Ligand binder design. Structure first.
Ligand SMILES: [Mg+2]
Ligand SMILES: [Mg+2]
Ligand SMILES: [Mg+2]
Lengths: 315, 315
């Protein structure tokens, strides 16, 4: 359907500039393209930043960035954050404004997992790093000065996939305890022939061929994609029941729209308390992309997620 | 699609023992059904309440209820509120919890218009009362101890129709200035054959025959229904341009969904900044009905609207 006007101007400018398709690029090139898009002078909430490594995960180490509202030294609730951008791309820079907004709005520490990206690392390295850091935070709360009984998880796009799977792993492994989960336009299935994949196959912004490529970078060739730790839409009502309350936010004009909304239904059917909202007039990645930060959908969704997290972690 | 479970329980109870269809009742009887449904003791935000009358509007007197956050005597911004329930039903009791939430969350005075109901009063009595009260508030700010430069309007269902029309009338008549407008699942058209009307014709909760009956109570026989003061979807890009930023919230499972989302697009095409959000798993009237008060969609939408108003009126 018809896009919000600032969002439309972005899409048209992108067409006019005529850049190479994402799946013709090397990982390094693809990374640099998104990094360059997100390198502008933009207003950002004030935070204190620490870059470090936790000695956990399948590789023995996971890079993290810890963010706190600037000057706040309280024992805060904590968000463990899993970023999107196709498994191949994304870093502390590309998602900086977004995760600063979440930290300050939630009034929480936020632990950004700088997981090993694809294709150099394939499934399941990142989800195991993600799970390991979440467990680490829960088990090292005095050192991080956080309250482990108020731990939320959150992520955008493939990072929403990671959020869902960490919830699933925490159920299976008996912890850690999760207070709430937030999923921005999550990847939850690999059915490239559903309604929204068919309708929006040629965009805007995200295309079916692009998703085909991202999935092929993430996964080993020939792996069974129906397994719930890959496509959590297939999780059993068992794996889902008992999970933390969820906020799921989708975009109207998005190949991934239908699977995110279907996943929200699956959670709800399993007895999970699910807040699920579709934003009209916007596109995939709309709370991360700096070019859309002043659009009404981006502002609304960030305010909604911030408030949802604040209530979950302080109410 | 499938409803949130508590919401489905409500719908199941109606199908089991809901009785005669609302539109087969007298207006008195219909009024009493909703009044009874909403008169349960339930947790509500603390406010101060004043019931009075402003000597304006087509009848010479419009009943209003003025709500403030409890004990607050500050010169506050103000919301003028137009309630829903089919033009036939609704009063200060049916919408009590909802408008208390908005007052407290926006930290604003709220002026609830107890307009004359249909069919005893037809169009255009209520919209002229509604506009008159809005003008009155702008022009008697010292009497009411409010800031007239921070005046918002808001409404639900046919009250969303009223919000749209008051915006239009204010454009046409040169004021008063409106800072923001909030429309919960508005009535904007009378095309009973569109997509969502066809899909949800027999419910849940709101039905196509009910809407046909409500419209018939509201309107004189043979009136041209395409007048934008009746169906604001027909407003020109000129009646719309210049209007205040809008929040439009729709329900997934609702005959009125498509016309609400279409109206949002019409505003956006006219250059208005429109925040438009569809809540999945819920039904029409979901922010007013007390039985749904603790459901995720109701809590979410009320928090969203409350925060949107707070930002508009205090930012
Ligand atoms: Mg989506
Ligand atoms: Mg609706
Ligand atoms: Mg818009």
């Amino acid at each position: 359907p018809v896009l919000e006007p600032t969002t439309q101007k972005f899409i048209n400018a992108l067409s006019a500039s005529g850049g190479p398709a994402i799946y013709t690029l090397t990982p390094a090139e693809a990374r640099d393209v998104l990094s360059g898009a997100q390198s502008g002078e933009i207003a950002k909430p004030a935070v204190d930043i620490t870059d470090t490594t936790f000695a956990v995960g399948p590789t023995g180490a996971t890079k993290v960035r810890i963010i706190r509202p600037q000057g706040n030294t309280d024992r805060l609730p904590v968000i463990v954050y899993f970023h999107g951008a196709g498994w191949v791309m994304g870093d502390t820079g590309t998602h900086d404004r977004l995760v600063r907004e979440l930290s300050v709005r939630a009034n929480a520490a936020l632990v950004f997992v700088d997981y090993e990206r694809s294709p150099e690392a394939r499934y399941p390295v990142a989800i195991e790093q993600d799970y390991a850091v979440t467990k680490y935070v829960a088990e090292h709360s005095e050192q991080l000065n956080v309250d482990p009984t108020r731990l939320a998880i959150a992520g955008d796009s493939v990072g929403g996939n990671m959020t869902a799977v960490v919830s699933l792993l925490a159920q299976e492994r008996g912890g850690p305890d999760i207070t709430a989960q937030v999923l921005f336009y999550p990847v939850t299935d690999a059915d490239f022939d559903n309604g929204s994949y068919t309708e929006f196959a040629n965009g805007p912004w995200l295309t079916k061929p692009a998703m085909d490529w991202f999935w092929n970078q993430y996964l080993p060739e020939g792996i069974d994609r129906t397994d719930p730790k890959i496509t959590p839409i297939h999780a059993t009502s068992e794996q889902l029941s008992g999970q933390a309350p969820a906020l799921v936010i989708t975009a109207e004009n998005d190949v991934l729209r239908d699977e995110g909304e279907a996943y929200a239904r699956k959670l709800s059917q399993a007895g999970v308390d699910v807040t699920v909202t579709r934003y009209n007039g916007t596109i995939h990645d709309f709370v991360m992309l700096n070019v859309l930060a002043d659009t009404p959908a981006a502002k609304g969704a960030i305010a909604q997620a911030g408030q949802y997290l604040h209530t979950a972690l302080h109410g």
